[PDB]
Amino acid sequence: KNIDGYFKIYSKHTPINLVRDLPQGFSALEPLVDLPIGINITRFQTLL
């Protein structure tokens, strides 16, 4: 998320065995990184 010129990153990792879908359950994401970058953002893309 991008707020007041800060780009904030949260994340978590979990073991799974369900290939098909997101698992039905709960676990929260911790803050990892916070970038004071000031960019106006409207679009994004992902690296393979």
């Binding site: 007041d4 010129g5 000031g38 106006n40």
Partner: peptide, 24 residues
């Protein structure tokens, strides 16, 4: 502070046009 003793010449190298947003 005033920088008339540093940045004046006049000097045209300084230019102008929001909350921590640049205007490139």
């Amino acid at each position: 502070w005033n920088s008339n003793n540093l940045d004046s010449k006049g000097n045209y190298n300084y230019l102008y046009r929001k909350p921590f947003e640049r205007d490139i």
